Paper text:
Our focus here is on KAT-II, which is a biologically active homodimer, and reportedly produces almost 75% of KYNA in human brain. The KATs irreversibly convert l-kynurenine (l-KYN), the main intermediate of the kynurenine pathway into KYNA, an endogenous neuroactive agent in CNS, as part of the main route of the tryptophan degradation pathway. KAT-II consists of 425 amino acid residues with its catalytic site at the homodimeric interface. [name] acts as a coenzyme and is covalently linked to Lys263 by a “Schiff base” reaction, resulting in an aldimine linkage.
In this paper the native structure of hKAT-II ([name] form) at 1.83 Å has been determined and refined, providing the highest resolution structure reported. The crystals belonged to the novel tetragonal space group P43212 with unit cell dimensions of a = 102.46 Å, b = 102.46 Å and c = 86.24 Å (α, β and γ = 90°). The asymmetric unit contains one molecule with an estimated solvent content of 48.1%. The final model contains all the residues of a total of 425, containing the one modified residue, LLP (lysine-pyridoxal-5′-phosphate (LLP), which is substituted for Lys263), and 438 solvent molecules. The state in which the side chain amino group of Lys263 forms an aldimine bond with [name], also referred to as the resting state is the state of the hKAT-II observed with no ambiguity in the electron density maps. Also the N-terminal arm is observed rolled into the location away from the active site, which does not otherwise affect the active site pocket. The oxygen of the pyridine ring hydroxyl moiety of LLP interacts with Asn202 and Tyr233, and the pyridine ring is also sitting parallel to and alongside the Tyr142 ring. Additionally, the pyridoxal ring of LLP has a hydrophobic interaction with Pro232, not previously reported in the other available aminotransferase structures. The side chain carboxylate oxygen of Asp230 takes part in a hydrogen bond with the NH pyridinium of LLP, which is seen to exist across all fold-type I proteins of the [name]-dependent enzyme family, which is generally considered crucial for enzyme function. The biological dimer is observed faithfully in the crystal structure.
Author numbering: 1 to 425
The structure:
């Protein structure tokens, strides 16, 4: 409602940047207009001329001469228009955000294609955080998010979490340190935002429930902080019905959502997108304008043509094939764990994503059990230390990936792990 509270002085100071009044006064004027004002290099010099890309369960994608010249040239900072338009309709279909027709100044929904979802997240953190600011999140958390927040000098306040994600009662108790009106008084530093991964948290695999999301949103309104919904496993949920998102209930315009195609379409193409209130999305776009400039035009056109041929039906059919694969992988790793973890460890069933979070019994720290003993036995799993702000503290947890391993490999790996646990007790 007052977005200036969430924008640093540096971010607010940004002004719009190049490739400007050249391809817009010419994108509506007469076809007889001569322009020597643009800053585009001549694309006829570029060496790639055509492309043919085959697609499984889809029409082959072809870039002819003219399309290739577009794919190899600069494009708009927020993304190419046909991809932005498709993605906007997808967000309306999946989330029907309340903010679609709000005035810009009070949070009109806006989208930005980013060079991966983490780029959007990083620029959002940089947009908001002054040194000393307080921010809320639940540990264990994605190590990359922790490493992104560390140099910004914010105080990370841990919110309790269990098998159903963030525990609202813990958030409420933490927030009771302040009065709601303190949010309009920056002297004692009410939290600027809550960050969470609401589906298939990396590393835990746990997901938030609908009732808790509603409680959390009410707290975000009461103490007027933003919700940063980092949802890269949104399309990798094993439940038949997806839990409503924070975006879908965001009547205030206080949610910034990051979506990713890295798990379902491609991680290497570096294409994700942000959805959020226009004043905040605009600050991110302005930062992109002086940084990457835009996501690869070529990769955007690959994805946009794929998605347009698929339609929303073909897209959802693809996600359902991917869910089917990962859910079978999940069943397989759970079977191996049931077989070989013998009351030697505890674990919750992942609700989404690609990781199993294992607590080993009777051992206080497992990085020595793995990085020393397990490595020479030919098995590797990741100690949980890296997913806490204080990574030097001992952790009895391991993160095991089921994205790729065959059932045989899982059986072997957990046999080895079981032996090591038993001979280490």
């Amino acid at each position: 409602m007052n977005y200036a509270r969430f924008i640093t002085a540096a971010s607010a100071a940004r002004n719009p940047s190049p490739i400007r009044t050249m391809t817009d006064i010419l994108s509506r004027g007469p076809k007889s207009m001569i322009s020597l004002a643009g800053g585009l290099p001549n694309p006829n010099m570029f060496p790639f001329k055509t492309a043919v890309i085959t697609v499984e369960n889809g029409k082959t994608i072809q870039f002819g001469e003219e399309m290739m010249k577009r794919a190899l040239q600069y494009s708009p900072s927020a993304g190419i228009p046909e991809l932005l338009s498709w993605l906007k309709q997808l967000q309306i279909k999946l989330h029907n955000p309340p903010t679609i027709h709000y005035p810009p100044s009070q949070g009109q929904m806006d989208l930005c294609v980013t060079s991966g979802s983490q780029q959007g997240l990083c620029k959002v953190f940089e947009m908001i955080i002054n040194p000393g600011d307080n921010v809320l999140l639940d540990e264990p958390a994605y190590s990359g998010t922790l490493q992104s927040l560390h140099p910004l000098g914010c105080n990370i306040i841990n919110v309790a979490s269990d098998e159903s994600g963030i525990v609202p009662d813990s958030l409420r108790d933490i927030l009771s340190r302040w009065k709601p009106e303190d949010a309009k008084n920056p002297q004692k530093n009410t939290p600027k935002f809550l960050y969470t991964v609401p589906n298939g948290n990396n590393p835990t695999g746990n997901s938030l429930t609908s009732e808790r999301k509603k409680e959390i949103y009410e707290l975000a309104r009461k103490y007027d902080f933003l919700i940063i919904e980092d949802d890269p496993y949104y399309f990798l949920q094993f439940n038949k019905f997806r839990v409503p998102t924070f975006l879908s209930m965001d009547v205030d315009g206080r949610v910034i959502r990051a979506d990713s195609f890295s798990k379902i379409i491609s991680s290497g193409l570096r294409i994700g997108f942000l959805t959020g209130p226009k004043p905040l999305i605009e600050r991110v776009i302005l930062h992109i304008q002086v940084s990457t400039l835009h996501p690869s035009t070529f990769n955007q056109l690959m994805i946009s043509q794929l998605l347009h041929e698929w339609g929303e039906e073909g897209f959802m059919a693809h996600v359902d094939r991917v869910i089917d694969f990962y859910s079978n992988q999940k069943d397989a790793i759970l079977a191996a764990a049931d077989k070989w973890l013998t009351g030697l460890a505890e674990w919750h069933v992942p609700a989404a994503g690609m990781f199993l979070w294992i607590k080993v019994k009777g051992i206080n720290d497992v990085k020595e059990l793995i990085e020393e003993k397990a490595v020479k036995m030919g098995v590797l799993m990741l100690p949980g230390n890296a997913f806490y702000v204080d990574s030097s503290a001992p952790s009895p947890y391991l993160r095991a990936s089921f994205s790729s391993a065959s059932p045989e490999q899982m059986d072997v790996a957990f046999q080895v792990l079981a032996q090591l646990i038993k001979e280490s007790l």
